[PDB]
């Protein structure tokens, strides 16, 4: 994918936005222990929607968070996971589905299971992603029976993670710059080598054209002569 959160943040640094909008990080401590909500904001709409769209997530719209429905959060979650975590959900499901492992008598109609398993795998993927962002509470309901509270909670954790990425970006350029240096060096070497080889072969072809047509012309006029005179 041509996009990411890292390169987009760099491009934003180069622009006048500064750090791609937002207020850096958030870490809520909690001693309500009679209650317990994990360490991240539940920052509300607008702030949430603005941050989501700042990360180049066009599907983010206020009408979805406060009134979510199935098949909408699914696309957004796939998009977020593939951007931050740099994977392909479709490739993973395809890998799970493939065959030449099991083989079994009553499994000649695995279709009745197949669909369900894909669902589960999707869900479980999200689980781990959200298990890495302070929430242990993804379950099926978030995907297929969404409610605004859990949606805003998960998205708040997500935006907090994104802001953390932005903050810690400075430790990364020491590597991005060297990567780009080496890649640009390779590209320049390849361009030079291609130019040299193309130049030589074009010169050879042009000379061949010259001399072939020279031979043709000499034969042309010699034979045109000798046909009239003999």
């Amino acid at each position: 994918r041509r996009k990411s959160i890292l390169h987009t943040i760099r491009n934003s640094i180069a622009s006048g936005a500064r750090i791609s909008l937002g207020s850096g990080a958030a870490r809520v401590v909690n001693g309500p222990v009679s209650r317990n909500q994990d360490v991240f904001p539940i920052l509300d709409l607008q702030e949430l929607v603005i941050c989501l769209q700042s990360c180049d997530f066009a599907l983010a719209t206020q009408e979805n968070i406060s009134r979510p429905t199935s098949d909408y959060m699914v696309t957004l979650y796939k998009q977020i996971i593939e951007n931050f975590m740099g994977i392909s959900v479709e490739s993973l499901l395809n890998s799970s589905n493939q065959e030449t492992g099991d083989g079994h008598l009553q499994e000649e109609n695995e279709n009745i299971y197949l669909d369900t398993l894909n669902v589960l795998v999707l869900n479980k993927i999200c689980f781990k992603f959200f298990e890495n962002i302070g929430v242990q509470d993804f379950n099926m309901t978030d995907l297929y029976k969404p409610e605004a509270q859990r949606t805003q909670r998960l998205l708040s954790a997500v935006v907090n993670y994104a802001r953390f990425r932005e903050e810690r970006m400075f430790d990364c350029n020491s590597f991005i710059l060297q990567m780009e240096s080496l890649l640009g060096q390779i590209n320049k070497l390849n361009d030079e080598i291609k130019q040299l080889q193309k130049d030589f072969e074009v010169e050879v072809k042009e000379i061949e054209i010259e001399y072939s047509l020279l031979s043709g012309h000499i034969n042309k006029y010699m034979n045109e002569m000798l046909e009239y005179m003999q």
Partner: protein
């Protein structure tokens, strides 16, 4: 529809043995103190049915916490799981599991056990897939072959590799951030090792390319030497041909002029 021959008792015996084996192999009896035996599967209680359904679905979706009214949630779970035989089962029957329609309930429990086993297999498959398609990039990037629109693909692969490293760093760092201790040195040194290996690979590639360009320069000079020799030879032969043809034409023209003049002298008479 439900093609399963649920009412057959040999089929039921097989299903009950499989369910018992799965629950024992995964310690249902220990995690929940309610024990399980095949006789129970033949003569189920309502509470034991609820416990088994809960245990199975939580093995299938740990993040879910029960709520509501289990009659209202079992249907919704099956609806979200798109249980293909959902339309064949009525919700009210959930109230009395051990009654007339116990066969469908035992059938869905077998469905869930099979789904659990297959889910575990799928997760192992995807984990191995991740570890393998991580190493596919490096193994591809250390083979010499091809040049077709792919050098761009090579740079893309390098970028993706480094991006993976960075994502690992960020995820671990955010783990430390949420766990309010802030020790980023371990994440940093793991990132440093990864990027060092990246640098070694890409610099090996760069050195290969530099040597290849130098060898190309040598070869092109050697070939242009021969090209120059051939061009000089062709020009030489062309000039010799031009002078010879010009001389032959001049001689023919002069002799024909002489003959024509002599013929004029002869005709005047």
């Amino acid at each position: 529809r439900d093609p399963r021959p649920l009412r057959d008792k040999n089929f039921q015996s097989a299903i009950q043995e499989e369910i018992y084996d799965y629950l024992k192999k995964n310690k249902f009896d220990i995690e929940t103190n309610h024990p399980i035996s095949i006789k129970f599967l033949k003569q189920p209680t309502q509470k034991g049915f609820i416990i088994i359904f809960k245990w199975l679905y939580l093995r299938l979706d740990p993040g879910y916490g029960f709520t509501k009214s289990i009659e209202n949630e079992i249907y919704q779970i099956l609806k979200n799981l798109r249980y293909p035989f959902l339309e064949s089962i009525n919700k009210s029957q959930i109230s009395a599991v051990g009654g007339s329609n116990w066969h469908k309930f035992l059938g869905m429990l077998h469905w869930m056990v099979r789904t659990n086993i297959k889910l575990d297999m799928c997760l192992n498959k995807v984990d191995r897939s991740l570890i393998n398609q991580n190493t596919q990039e490096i193994t591809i990037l250390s083979q010499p072959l091809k040049t077709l629109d792919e050098q761009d693909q090579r740079q893309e692969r390098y970028e993706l590799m480094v991006e993976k490293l960075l994502i690992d760093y960020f995820t671990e760092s955010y783990k430390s951030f949420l766990k309010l201790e802030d020790n980023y040195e371990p994440s940093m040194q793991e990132l440093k090792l990864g990027f060092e290996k990246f640098v070694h690979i890409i610099n090996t590639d760069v050195t290969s390319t530099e040597l290849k360009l130098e060898e190309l320069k040598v070869d092109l000079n050697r070939k242009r030497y021969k090209l120059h020799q051939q061009v000089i030879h062709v020009i030489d032969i062309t000039s010799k041909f031009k002078i010879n043809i010009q001389s032959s034409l001049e001689n023919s023209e002069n002799e024909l002029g002489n003959v024509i003049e002599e013929l004029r002298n002869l005709e005047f008479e």
